[PDB]
């Protein structure tokens, strides 16, 4: 009768680092996530889920509004989110739920709503208006660092230097050494302690909780013993072209990122380019990444154990997802940028209340992060806002993929200049011409740029997106077809704020179909 929602949002966790799917495909599950595996056994694992944009700001705007980037317009980190969009926090209040949130949303405020001197305009983003923060990372991670200091741990003068490899002789970069922060004071421990505090405060009352984890976001360094938990040789090999120049030749945007991404954005204090990492260094980076993932899973076990002991597990809808993926060396790239699958494909696992009709199933239907907000509101008995682009995933938990479900995946990326990454001059583009959209299915992937060449991949023969076919005249009809599907997608998703209203002889009315 009581209904809780636990929305777990990790950061930078790839869809192909989900053991349940690896085992289903007969692959070696090279990492351990027993608590995520529990959700998979009890619920539905969605194997074709994408975030509709990257990096964190855009991806979290889509997750928390149910809108594509084409509508929310929070197109990059540092770009404001218009206050007109209804977010999940405000919608939760509409159904009587407190929108409690741990972690962060990386939201720049609307300048029309606050002073231009607002300190929230000094950072990548701050908490989205409408949520109730009960465990904030805070900008500059001040919430975490203050908790570390209050726990009695002496921090270095530059606090992110806790993420340098242990030892004054250590070389910054991919490392086999632990970080300089003990496990009991890690950021994953922090968010977990906030979750337990909040759940204990609720004392059995119905809850919504957005439980955000920073890891496995970089720096790719882990508290002991997670730094040594996986052997580099057991990791999947990175997938990349023969050298960075051949890789970059595919497209100007690929060249910009191959040339510009720096190791220091991924390892604390590191020097050099991301593209020059060798296979051994990429394998070590992947092993450390897996260590950070297992630490999150260990922490989730503590949260799940509290739900078990208080008898709330079977009353709670649990949704596990990530904001976006990570290239992890694929295509000579680090991070979440561009158009490749690994930046956008993300885990999604949903466990309904009670015994799940499809417990253990793996769903191939094409799902998008914009679907999560409608799913939560549907489940709590609210109406889905008219403006949302996504649709509720609840049918997948009972009977399966609806007959009229989408037949392609869609995502977008905007690469206009921000303070730390400025491709416009290299690309020769103005700020409103720096975007792309992607449409794909089981067979083909089409990447359309507003003002650069398009790309087209045959995923059966070229699953790793190495061979652009868009300019091959033998593919003209196929490229036409996918450009046409994407164009229809644009038309179908124009803003829906008031378009159901009608004047007329009987006064104001609303159309429902």
Ligand X SMILES: O=P(O)(O)c1ccccc1
- Binding residues among 438-467 for a second copy as defined by CB under 8 A: 448-451, 454
User: CB of 212 within 8 A of CB of 101?
Assistant: yes
Q: Which lies closer to Mn ion via its Cβ, residue 19 or residue 335?
A: 335
> To 5 degrees, how large is the angle CA 154–CA 160–CA 164?
90
Of residues 375 through 434, those in contact with Na ion by CB under 5 A are 420
Task: Return d(Cα 229, Cα 76) in angstroms, integer.
Answer: 35
Q: Which does 104 bind (CB under 5 to 8 A by kind): ligand X, Mn ion, a second copy, none?
A: ligand X
Q: Which lies closer to ligand X via its Cβ, residue 12 or residue 35?
A: 12
Q: Which lies closer to a second copy via its Cβ, residue 113 or residue 276?
A: 113
Strands of 376-494, DSSP E = 409-414, 435-440, 444-449, 455-458
Q: Which does 97 bind (CB under 5 to 8 A by kind): ligand X, a second copy, Mn ion, none?
A: a second copy
Q: Which of 115, 276, 398, 467 is the binder for a second copy (CB under 8 A)?
A: 115
Site for ligand X contains 104 (CB under 6 A): yes
Q: Which does 84 bind (CB under 5 to 8 A by kind): Mn ion, a second copy, Na ion, none?
A: a second copy
What DSSP line would sit under 119-156, residue for residue? GGGGSS-BPPTT-EEEEE--GGGHHHHHHHHHTTPPPP
What is the enclosing helix (H) or strand (E) of 212? strand 208-212
User: CB of 485 within 8 A of CB of 491?
Assistant: no
Of residues 114 through 143, those in contact with ligand X by CB under 6 A are 124
Task: Return d(Cα 178, Cα 291) in angstroms, integer.
Answer: 11
Sheet with 348-351: strands ordered across = 132-136, 99-103, 208-212, 4-10, 316-322, 348-351, 44-46, 362-363
User: CB of 330 within 8 A of CB of 238?
Assistant: yes
Q: For helices 279-309 and 34-42, give the axis angle rounded to 10 degrees.
A: 60
Site for Na ion contains 481 (CB under 5 A): yes
Site for a second copy contains 174 (CB under 8 A): no
The site map against ligand X for 211-240 (x = CB under 6 A) is: ------x-----------------------
User: CB of 3 within 8 A of CB of 379?
Assistant: yes
Of residues 153 through 172, those in contact with a second copy by CB under 8 A are 159
Task: Return d(Cα 249, Cα 232) in angstroms, integer.
Answer: 30
Q: How many Cβ atoms sit within 10 Å of the Cβ of residue 246?
A: 12
Of residues 126 through 145, those in contact with a second copy by CB under 8 A are 133-134, 138, 142-143, 145
User: CB of 172 within 8 A of CB of 271?
Assistant: yes
Q: Which of 43, 55, 165, 338 is the binder for ligand X (CB under 6 A)?
A: 55
The site map against a second copy for 49-88 (x = CB under 8 A) is: ---------------------xx-x-x--xxx-x-x----
Task: Return d(Cα 4, Cα 25) in angstroms, integer.
Answer: 33
Q: Which of 33, 48, 77, 107 is the binder for ligand X (CB under 6 A)?
A: 77
Selected range binding Na ion among 44-52, 126-134, 231-239, 478-486, rule: CB under 5 A: 478-486
For residue 293, the minimal CB distance to ligand X (Å) is 15
Can you read off the two tokens belonging to residue 7?
């929305």
Site for ligand X contains 263 (CB under 6 A): no
Q: For helices 187-202 and 142-150, give the axis angle rounded to 10 degrees.
A: 90
Q: Which of 103, 125, 274, 347 is the binder for a second copy (CB under 8 A)?
A: 125
If we measure between CA atoms, which residue out of 45, 50, 51 comes closest to residue 23?
45
For residue 151, the minimal CB distance to a second copy (Å) is 9
Q: Which lies closer to Na ion via its Cβ, residue 362 or residue 418?
A: 418
For residue 415, the minimal CB distance to Mn ion (Å) is 16
Q: Which lies closer to a second copy via its Cβ, residue 26 or residue 473?
A: 473
Q: Which does 73 bind (CB under 5 to 8 A by kind): Mn ion, a second copy, ligand X, none?
A: a second copy
Q: Which of 27, 28, 34, 96 is the binder for a second copy (CB under 8 A)?
A: 96
Can you read off the two tokens belonging to residue 211?
């439980």
Q: In terms of C-beta density within 10 A (0-12 exposed, 13-18 middle, 19 or more buried), how is residue 379 classed? A: buried
Of residues 399 through 428, those in contact with a second copy by CB under 8 A are 416-419, 424
The site map against a second copy for 203-222 (x = CB under 8 A) is: x-------------------
For residue 214, the minimal CB distance to a second copy (Å) is 16
For residue 451, the minimal CB distance to Na ion (Å) is 12
Chain contacts with ligand X (rule: CB under 6 A)? 11, 55-56, 77, 104, 106, 124, 217
């Amino acid at each position: 009768r009581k209904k809780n929602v636990l929305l777990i949002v990790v950061d930078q966790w790839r869809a192909d680092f989900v053991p349940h799917v690896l085992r289903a495909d007969g692959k070696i599950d090279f990492l351990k996530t027993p608590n995520l595996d529990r959700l998979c056994r009890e619920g539905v694992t969605f194997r074709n889920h994408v975030t509709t944009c990257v990096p964190a700001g855009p991806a979290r705007a889509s997750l928390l509004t149910g809108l594509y980037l084409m509508n929310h317009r929070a197109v990059q980190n540092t770009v404001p989110l218009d206050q007109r969009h209804l977010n999940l926090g405000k919608a939760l209040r509409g159904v009587g739920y407190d929108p409690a949130l741990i972690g962060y949303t990386t939201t720049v405020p609307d300048p029309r709503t606050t002073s231009p001197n607002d300190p929230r305009f000094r950072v990548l983003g701050d908490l989205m208006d409408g949520f109730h923060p009960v465990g904030a990372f805070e900008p500059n991670m001040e919430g975490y660092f203050g908790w570390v200091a209050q726990n009695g741990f002496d921090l270095p003068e530059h606090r992110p230097d806790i993420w340098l490899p242990e030892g004054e002789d250590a070389v910054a970069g991919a490392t086999d050494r632990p970080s300089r922060i003990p496990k009991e004071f890690s950021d994953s421990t922090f968010f977990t302690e906030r979750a337990l505090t909040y759940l204990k405060g609720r004392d059995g009352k119905p809850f919504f909780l957005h439980l955000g984890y920073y890891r496995p976001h970089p720096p790719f360094v882990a508290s002991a013993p997670y730094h040594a938990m996986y052997r580099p040789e057991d990791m999947p090999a990175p997938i990349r072209a023969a050298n960075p120049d051949i890789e970059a030749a595919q497209h100007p945007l690929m060249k910009f990122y191959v040339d510009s991404i720096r190791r220091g954005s991924f390892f604390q204090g590191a020097e050099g380019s991301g593209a020059t990492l060798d296979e051994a260094e990429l394998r070590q980076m992947r092993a450390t990444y897996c260590g950070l993932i297992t630490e999150v899973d260990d922490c989730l076990g503590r949260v799940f154990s509290y739900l078990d002991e208080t008898g709330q597990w079977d009353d709670t809808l649990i949704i596990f997802t990530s904001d976006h993926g990570e290239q992890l060396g694929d295509h000579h790239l680090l991070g979440k940028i561009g158009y490749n699958d690994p930046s956008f494909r993300i885990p999604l696992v949903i466990k309904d209340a009670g015994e799940n009709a499809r417990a253990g199933a793996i769903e191939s239907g094409f799902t998008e992060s914009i679907d999560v907000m409608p799913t939560i509101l549907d489940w709590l008995g609210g109406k889905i806002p008219h403006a949302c682009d996504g649709l509720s995933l609840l049918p997948f938990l009972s009977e399966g993929r609806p007959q009229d479900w989408r037949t392609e995946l869609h995502y977008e990326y905007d690469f206009r200049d921000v303070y730390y990454s400025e491709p416009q001059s290299f690309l020769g583009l103005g700020m409103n011409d720096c975007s792309l959209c992607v449409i794909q299915d089981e067979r083909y992937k089409y990447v359309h740029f507003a003002a650069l060449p398009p790309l087209f991949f045959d995923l059966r023969h070229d699953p790793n997106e190495f061979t652009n076919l868009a300019d091959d005249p033998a593919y003209a009809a196929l490229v036409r077809d996918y450009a046409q599907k994407a164009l229809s997608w644009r038309l179908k998703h124009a803003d829906r704020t008031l378009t159901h209203y009608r004047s007329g002889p009987e006064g104001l009315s609303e159309r429902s179909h």
